[PDB]
Design an enzyme around this catalytic site. Sequence first.
Site, PDB file in Angstrom:
ATOM      1  N   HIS A  70     -50.223  28.185 -44.345  1.00 28.39           N
ATOM      2  CA  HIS A  70     -50.833  27.514 -43.205  1.00 28.39           C
ATOM      3  C   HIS A  70     -52.340  27.747 -43.146  1.00 28.39           C
ATOM      4  CE1 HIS A  70     -52.197  26.968 -39.077  1.00 28.39           C
ATOM      5  NE2 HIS A  70     -52.598  28.223 -39.159  1.00 28.39           N
TER       6      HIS A  70
ATOM      7  N   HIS B 113     -56.069  27.770  -3.175  1.00 26.79           N
ATOM      8  CA  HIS B 113     -56.780  26.514  -3.313  1.00 26.79           C
ATOM      9  C   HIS B 113     -58.296  26.657  -3.242  1.00 26.79           C
ATOM     10  CE1 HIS B 113     -52.822  24.861  -2.911  1.00 26.79           C
ATOM     11  NE2 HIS B 113     -53.258  23.618  -2.809  1.00 26.79           N
TER      12      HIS B 113
ATOM     13  N   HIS C  33     -57.603  26.305 -44.070  1.00 23.05           N
ATOM     14  CA  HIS C  33     -56.204  25.953 -43.856  1.00 23.05           C
ATOM     15  C   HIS C  33     -55.796  24.916 -44.882  1.00 23.05           C
ATOM     16  CE1 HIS C  33     -57.675  27.504 -40.042  1.00 23.05           C
ATOM     17  NE2 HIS C  33     -56.421  27.814 -39.762  1.00 23.05           N
TER      18      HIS C  33
ATOM     19  N   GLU D 118     -54.023  17.526 -14.542  1.00 19.26           N
ATOM     20  CA  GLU D 118     -55.469  17.729 -14.625  1.00 19.26           C
ATOM     21  C   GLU D 118     -55.949  17.917 -16.053  1.00 19.26           C
ATOM     22  OE1 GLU D 118     -53.528  19.796 -12.800  1.00 19.26           O
ATOM     23  OE2 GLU D 118     -53.944  19.125 -10.741  1.00 19.26           O
TER      24      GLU D 118
HETATM   25  C1  8EO Z   1     -51.614  28.830 -32.993  1.00 19.77           C
HETATM   26  C2  8EO Z   1     -52.574  28.149 -33.940  1.00 19.77           C
HETATM   27  N1  8EO Z   1     -53.914  28.267 -33.800  1.00 19.77           N
HETATM   28  C3  8EO Z   1     -54.579  28.971 -32.699  1.00 19.77           C
HETATM   29  C4  8EO Z   1     -54.700  28.148 -31.489  1.00 19.77           C
HETATM   30  C5  8EO Z   1     -54.037  28.547 -30.348  1.00 19.77           C
HETATM   31  N2  8EO Z   1     -54.162  27.837 -29.174  1.00 19.77           N
HETATM   32  C6  8EO Z   1     -54.936  26.734 -29.112  1.00 19.77           C
HETATM   33  C7  8EO Z   1     -55.045  26.054 -27.880  1.00 19.77           C
HETATM   34  N3  8EO Z   1     -55.586  26.276 -30.187  1.00 19.77           N
HETATM   35  C8  8EO Z   1     -55.507  26.976 -31.348  1.00 19.77           C
HETATM   36  N4  8EO Z   1     -56.204  26.504 -32.373  1.00 19.77           N
HETATM   37  C9  8EO Z   1     -54.705  27.468 -34.726  1.00 19.77           C
HETATM   38  S1  8EO Z   1     -53.552  26.709 -35.863  1.00 19.77           S
HETATM   39  C10 8EO Z   1     -52.161  27.173 -34.844  1.00 19.77           C
HETATM   40  C11 8EO Z   1     -50.822  27.126 -35.513  1.00 19.77           C
HETATM   41  C12 8EO Z   1     -50.518  25.638 -35.410  1.00 19.77           C
HETATM   42  O1  8EO Z   1     -49.229  25.379 -35.941  1.00 19.77           O
HETATM   43  P1  8EO Z   1     -49.023  23.880 -36.384  1.00 19.77           P
HETATM   44  O2  8EO Z   1     -47.551  23.679 -36.609  1.00 19.77           O
HETATM   45  O3  8EO Z   1     -49.692  22.927 -35.442  1.00 19.77           O
HETATM   46  O4  8EO Z   1     -49.820  23.803 -37.782  1.00 19.77           O
HETATM   47  P2  8EO Z   1     -49.327  23.919 -39.270  1.00 19.77           P
HETATM   48  O5  8EO Z   1     -48.628  25.271 -39.381  1.00 19.77           O
HETATM   49  O6  8EO Z   1     -50.571  24.031 -40.137  1.00 19.77           O
HETATM   50  O7  8EO Z   1     -48.321  22.867 -39.561  1.00 19.77           O
HETATM   51  C1  8EO Z   2     -51.189  16.909  -6.034  1.00 25.66           C
HETATM   52  C2  8EO Z   2     -50.660  17.841  -4.971  1.00 25.66           C
HETATM   53  N1  8EO Z   2     -51.367  18.915  -4.551  1.00 25.66           N
HETATM   54  C3  8EO Z   2     -52.648  19.345  -5.120  1.00 25.66           C
HETATM   55  C4  8EO Z   2     -52.488  20.145  -6.341  1.00 25.66           C
HETATM   56  C5  8EO Z   2     -52.983  19.648  -7.528  1.00 25.66           C
HETATM   57  N2  8EO Z   2     -52.903  20.385  -8.689  1.00 25.66           N
HETATM   58  C6  8EO Z   2     -52.339  21.611  -8.693  1.00 25.66           C
HETATM   59  C7  8EO Z   2     -52.301  22.331  -9.906  1.00 25.66           C
HETATM   60  N3  8EO Z   2     -51.816  22.142  -7.584  1.00 25.66           N
HETATM   61  C8  8EO Z   2     -51.911  21.452  -6.418  1.00 25.66           C
HETATM   62  N4  8EO Z   2     -51.415  22.040  -5.339  1.00 25.66           N
HETATM   63  C9  8EO Z   2     -50.678  19.774  -3.597  1.00 25.66           C
HETATM   64  S1  8EO Z   2     -49.136  18.963  -3.197  1.00 25.66           S
HETATM   65  C10 8EO Z   2     -49.335  17.806  -4.541  1.00 25.66           C
HETATM   66  C11 8EO Z   2     -48.482  16.576  -4.471  1.00 25.66           C
HETATM   67  C12 8EO Z   2     -47.170  17.123  -5.016  1.00 25.66           C
HETATM   68  O1  8EO Z   2     -46.218  16.075  -5.098  1.00 25.66           O
HETATM   69  P1  8EO Z   2     -44.726  16.586  -5.119  1.00 25.66           P
HETATM   70  O2  8EO Z   2     -43.863  15.427  -5.531  1.00 25.66           O
HETATM   71  O3  8EO Z   2     -44.582  17.845  -5.917  1.00 25.66           O
HETATM   72  O4  8EO Z   2     -44.452  16.968  -3.578  1.00 25.66           O
HETATM   73  P2  8EO Z   2     -43.769  16.167  -2.411  1.00 25.66           P
HETATM   74  O5  8EO Z   2     -44.549  14.863  -2.277  1.00 25.66           O
HETATM   75  O6  8EO Z   2     -44.041  16.938  -1.129  1.00 25.66           O
HETATM   76  O7  8EO Z   2     -42.372  15.819  -2.777  1.00 25.66           O
END
Ligand code: 8EO
Ligand code: 8EO
Lengths: 675, 675
Positions: free
Chosen positions: A259, A476, A25, A413
Site C-alpha cells: 500500500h 451549541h 504509495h 456539514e
Molecule cells: C488510513 C490511510 N491514510 C491516513 C489517512 C487517515 N485519515 C484521513 C482522513 N486521511 C488519511 N489520508 C492514508 S492512506 C489510508 C489507507 C487507505 O486505505 P485505502 O483502502 O483507501 O487505500 P489502498 O490500501 O491503497 O487501497
Molecule cells: C439541524 C438541527 N439542529 C442543528 C444542528 C446541526 N448540526 C449538528 C451537528 N447538530 C445540530 N444540533 C438541531 S435539531 C436539527 C434538526 C434535526 O432534525 P431531526 O429530524 O433529527 O429532529 P426532529 O425534526 O425534531 O424530528
Amino acid sequence: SVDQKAISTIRLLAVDAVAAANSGHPGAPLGLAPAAHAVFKKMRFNPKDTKWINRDRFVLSNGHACALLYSMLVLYGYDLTVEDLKKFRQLGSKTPGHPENTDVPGAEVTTGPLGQGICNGVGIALAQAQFAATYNKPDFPISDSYTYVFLGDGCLMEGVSSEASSLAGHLQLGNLIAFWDDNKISIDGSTEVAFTEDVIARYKSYGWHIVEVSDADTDITAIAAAIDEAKKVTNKPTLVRLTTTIGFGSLAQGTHGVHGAPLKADDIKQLKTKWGFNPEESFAVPAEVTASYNEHVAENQKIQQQWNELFAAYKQKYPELGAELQRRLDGKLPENWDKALPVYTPADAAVATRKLSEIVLSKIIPEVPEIIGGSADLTPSNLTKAKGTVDFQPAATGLGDYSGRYIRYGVREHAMGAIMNGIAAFGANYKNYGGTFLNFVSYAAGAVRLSALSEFPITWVATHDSIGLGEDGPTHQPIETLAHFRATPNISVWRPADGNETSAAYKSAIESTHTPHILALTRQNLPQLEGSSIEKASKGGYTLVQQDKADIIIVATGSEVSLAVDALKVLEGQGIKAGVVSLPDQLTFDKQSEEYKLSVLPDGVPILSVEVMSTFGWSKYSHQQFGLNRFGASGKAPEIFKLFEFTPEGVAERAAKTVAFYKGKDVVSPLRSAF
Amino acid sequence: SVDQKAISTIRLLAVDAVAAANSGHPGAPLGLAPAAHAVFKKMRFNPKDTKWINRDRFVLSNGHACALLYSMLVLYGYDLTVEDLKKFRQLGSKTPGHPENTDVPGAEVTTGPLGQGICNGVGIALAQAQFAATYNKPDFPISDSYTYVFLGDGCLMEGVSSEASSLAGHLQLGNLIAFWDDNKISIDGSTEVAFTEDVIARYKSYGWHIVEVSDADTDITAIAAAIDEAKKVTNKPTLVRLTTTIGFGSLAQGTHGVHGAPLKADDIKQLKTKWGFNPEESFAVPAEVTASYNEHVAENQKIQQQWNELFAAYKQKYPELGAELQRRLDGKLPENWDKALPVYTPADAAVATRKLSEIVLSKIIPEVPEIIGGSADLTPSNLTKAKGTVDFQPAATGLGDYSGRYIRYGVREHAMGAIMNGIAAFGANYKNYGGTFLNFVSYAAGAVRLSALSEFPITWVATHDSIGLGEDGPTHQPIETLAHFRATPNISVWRPADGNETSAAYKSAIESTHTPHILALTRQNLPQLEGSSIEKASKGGYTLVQQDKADIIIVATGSEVSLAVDALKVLEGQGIKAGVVSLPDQLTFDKQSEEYKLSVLPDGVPILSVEVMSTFGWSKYSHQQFGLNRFGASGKAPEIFKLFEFTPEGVAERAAKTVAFYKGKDVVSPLRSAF
Ligand SMILES: CC1=[N+](Cc2cnc(C)nc2N)CS[C@H]1CCOP(=O)(O)OP(=O)(O)O
Ligand SMILES: CC1=[N+](Cc2cnc(C)nc2N)CS[C@H]1CCOP(=O)(O)OP(=O)(O)O
Ligand SMILES: [Ca+2]
Ligand SMILES: [Ca+2]
C-alpha cells in the site's frame, strides 16, 4: 497490444516515481492503472487548456495514489514531465506526495485527506448540472460533461463520503461516475478486520446505479462498457465496483505492505521483465504509447475547437446569456454588482447579523447569477434562502429544478463543505455558500482546511456565533471556533458588527478568488454603529471611534463592538478616554499596509481586546484580552453576558485596570515585533 | 389506562417545560413519549444509584428532544424534580437546553450535536461487551446490560453515525438497540427535500437487524415486542423504526413548525383536554403514574440488590478478578501502576515519540486492565498496538474476541472519537485511547469538543505531528491543530520532547478522570534530553536548562526543545546566554501555582517561543513567537525545517533579534496581566 503497453507504462512510471523518492504509495497505482487508462480514453480534456469549461473532470479521491494521476498527466502532455516525476515527493516539485490543485496542472482539487475527493466530485457534478440547466438551449449543449472519481476503501469508511453519496443519490446526479477500488486491503490489513459492510447494497439504498467489474486487473473492455452503461442512466450517479489486486504484478501484490512503501528493487525488475520492459531502465515511455495518447488528445482538441464555435454561435443566438457566460468564463463579476449591497445609517433599526445576511443575499442573488448556496438543514435559522428562488433539485421530484439556486444539504456539514469546494472547482466564477451554526462548522474542519489549502472562494454563513444564541447552551455556543479558523492559513473570518460591516463581509466573500470566507453572524439584534461604512470595514480593521487623547483603545468584533462603544461612555464617567477599533476580519486587516495598520493600532497607548470567545490570536492586536475561555451556559442570552461580565461596566472595569497596569510603562503597538 | 395516562403525562410535562422557558423543542418529545415509556419500562436502572455498573443505559442522540428525557428522569425519581423542569433552559438550572452529563443526573453523555449520541451508544455497548468478556463467569453474569439509543433523521444524515453504524454492525454488538424516530420532518421541512435514501436497506447493509413499528404513536405493545425481538438477536445491533407523527396531538403535528418552538397556548389547552388533563394546570403528575413508575423502580432496586450479592459471591469464587473489579468500580488505578512507565537517560538513543508511545503502551497495558484502545486504520504508523494483545472482535469472525483490548476502528476518526466518549461513559475506570495522524484528529472535532465538555478521560494518540512527517506534504502537516484544541476548554494537549516527557504525558492521560488528552507525537527521532524527568514534565512546563544570567529564555515543545538546546549553543558563540523551558502541556502548566509558573517564566528576561506550527496561544508564555503560520510542503523533513529556518542558526538569529528588541525596555513575565 498498445493498450497493454500503455497500462504497463503507467504502472512502471508510478513505481519508478515512488522508487526515486524512496517514499509513497505504489499499491493502488498498480491496481488502478487499467481503470485509469480506460477512463482517460473516455474523457474529453485538453492538456493545453486545463480550464476548458466543458471538459470531463477526473478526481483521485484516494489521493495517496497520486503517482498514478501524475503518470497519466505526464503521458497525456499536461504541463508535467518525466523530469517532474523523478522529483516526486521532493521539496518544491510539481509532484507533491498528495495532489494539490494550486501546484499540479490537471489536479482539479486537493486530495489526500480521505473521503474529500468523492464529495468534491459530487460538487463538480452538482455545479455542472446547475450550469447546464442555466445555459444549455436547443442545439446548444454548452455543458454536457461528466465527473469521474476514483476512490478506495478508506474513502468509503469516512462518514463525509456517506453524507455526499446520500445527497448525490437524492439529487439524481447522472453525470457522476465513481469507481471503487475494491482491493480488500487498507493500512491495517484486510478489510475483514473493520469494513465488512455490503457497500453495493448501501449505494443502492442511496439511489445509485451499480456496475460491477469482476476482473478489473485486466478487463478494460468491461471498464469501458461500465462507463457506457453509466452514461445511459441519466437519473442516478453510478458506482463502478473495480475488483482489483492491490499492487497487481508485484511479488507483494494483495498485501498491506504494498500500500504505502516503495517496492523492493528486485520486485521492480521482475515487474519490468514480465511486462516486456527493460529492468535496467527507469521512467520508460514507449513512443507507441505517446502516439496513442496523442491521438486521443488531438481528437479532444478538435472537440474543444468545435465547442468554441458552438459558443460563438450561442452568443449570436442568445446574446444576453452568451455575454453572461463569457463574463463568467473570464472570471469577472457583473459591472458594479456591489451597488446592490445594502447600506445603513446609525438612524436605522437594530438587526441581527444573520438577518442582515439574509437581506444581502436577497439583493445580490438576483444581480449575480453565479451565486448559489444552501444550508445544512438550518434554512429558517441561518436565513440563507432568498425569497422567490427555487431549490436545486431534479425536476422529477417536483421540489425544484437543476436551474435552482438553493441547495438543501440536509444535516451534512462536512459534505456541504467538501461539495462547496467541488462547486468552486468547477469554475465558471461560481461563488457558493453554505449555512450552519458556527459551532457546527467544526464538523466540516477537514473540508474547510482544504478550502484554504486549495485557495477556493467558498463562503460559510455561520450563524448563532456565540453565547448570544442563549438557551441552546454550551453544546451549541462557540468558544474555540474562530481561533481555530483564524489560525488556519488563508481563511478570512468575518465577524461583522452591523449592517455596513455585513455588506463589507459579503463584498469580500463574493469578490474572493483565492480565499475562503467564514461569516460569523449573530442570532441577536445589534445596533447600527456610528462610524461604520462598507469602505472602512473593507479594510478588515478600522478606527470606529477616534480619540486623539486616548488612555486606551478597545478593539472588538461583532456583537462586542457595540459593547465597547457603551463601555466608552462608562469610562468617560470614570475620567478615562477610550477609542474603539472594529476588527471585522483579521486576515484582511493583516494584508493592509503597515502604515494603515499602525494608524488603527498605534504605539503609545494600551489596547484591550473584547470578543466573547477564546482570547487566542488576540495578542496580535492588543496588550490585554477580555474573552471567554470556558464553555458557555444554557439560559437567556442577556443573562449569560451578565454572568460573564460582558457588560459595559465589566468592560470598563477591565479597561481601567489595563490603564492602571501600564502606568509608568512605555507601550508600543502590538503590531511591532522583533523579527 | 395507567400506561396511557403515563404517556400523556410525559408529553404534557415536556410541552409545559418548553412553554415555561418559551424556548425549546416540543415535537420530538410528543412523538417519542410512547417509545420512551415502553423503553424505560424494559430498562433496569436505579434512580438512587446512577452509577450501578450493570444498569441498562439510555442515550438521547436527538438531544434537542431533552424535555422528554428530563420528564422521564423526573417521573422515575432521579435527582431532578418538577421544580427543575420549570427551570428548563434557564441559567444555572439542572435542565439545560441540551443534556449534559456533568449537570443532569441520568444523562449518560452530552448530546445535542447531531450524530454523537448514537456513536456514544456504540461505545457504551462496545465497553459492555469487553467488560462482560473480561469478568463474566459461569453462574456470574456480572455484566449483561443493554444500550438503548433514540435518534432522529438528523443523526442519520450526519456521517459520524454512518461510521459508527458500519463499525457496530461489523462488531456484532447485539446488546445495542437503537430507535429511529421516523417522522419525516426536519428543520427544512419534509425529509423528501434532502433525505430520501432507504435507511432500512442501508442498516441491513451494515449487518443490523431491523424491526419496524408502523404505528409508534400508540402501539406500545409493538414497541415492547420489538425490544424482546432485538434481545433474541445476539449477534447484530438492532434498529427499531418508529413511525411517528412529530408533535403528535398538537394542532401543528406533522409540521416543521412543531420541531423547535413552543406550542401556542390554545394548542396546549386542547392537548390537555383530549388526554383528560386540566387545561388550566401545568406540570401535572398524576399519582397513579408515580405509583406505576415507582413499582418499576422498586423492582429494579431489588435486581440491583441481588446483583450486589452476586458480586459479593463473585469476589469469593474469583478472588483476583473480584478485587480487580472492585478497584475499578472504586475509580482507582492499580497501586504503583506508574512504576511500569519507562524512564530514560541522556545516554539513551534517540527515539521518535510515536515509538516511545508504543513502548509505554507495551509496558502499561499488561499492568492496567482498564486500558483499551485502537487506531483509525493507522496501527503500524501510530504504533498503538502492544505485541501479544488480541483485537476486540466478535469471536465468530476468528479475528479477535470481545475480551480483546485493541480496536480496529477503520478510517473513521470522528466515530472513533465519539465511541471513545461512550467507552469512557460506560465507567468501570476505562482509560481508552484512539490513534490517528494529528492532522486528522480535526475530522473528529465534533466529538473531541464533547470529550472536553463531558469531562471524559479519553486519549488521542496523535502521531505525525508536524512538517517533521516530511513527504506526505501539506495536506497531512498540522499547522492550526494544536491551537484549536488548546483554545478549547479542558483539553490537555501534550507534545512530549523525549522519552521521559512521553511517560509523563501517559501518566497524566491515564490518571485523568475529568480531562481528555491529545498526545502529539513525532514521526522522526528525537534525542533524550539532559534535564528531563517524569517528575519535572508532570508539571506541564519546567525549566530544562537554567541560566541564572540569561539574556533570553527559549520556551519550546516537542521536537523544538532539542532545537532550542542546539540554538543555545549557537547563541553562546554569539555572546548570548539562554535558558530553555520545555512546555509539554500548557493546560497542566496553567494549573500549577502562580509561584511555580513564575519560576519557569520569570520577570526581567525576554522569552521567545519555538514550535513549528501556529503561534496562536503562545503569547501566554512568551514575548516573541517563532512558529509556522503557513501551510507546509512535500519533501524530506530536514529540508522542510531548513526551508522555514527551524534550524539552530535560525532560532539563534531570532533570539538575538529578540534580545536586541528589548534593549532598554523593562520586561515582565508573559504570565502577568492587568486582570
Ligand atoms: C488510513 C490511510 N491514510 C491516513 C489517512 C487517515 N485519515 C484521513 C482522513 N486521511 C488519511 N489520508 C492514508 S492512506 C489510508 C489507507 C487507505 O486505505 P485505502 O483502502 O483507501 O487505500 P489502498 O490500501 O491503497 O487501497
Ligand atoms: C439541524 C438541527 N439542529 C442543528 C444542528 C446541526 N448540526 C449538528 C451537528 N447538530 C445540530 N444540533 C438541531 S435539531 C436539527 C434538526 C434535526 O432534525 P431531526 O429530524 O433529527 O429532529 P426532529 O425534526 O425534531 O424530528
Ligand atoms: Ca483498499
Ligand atoms: Ca425528524
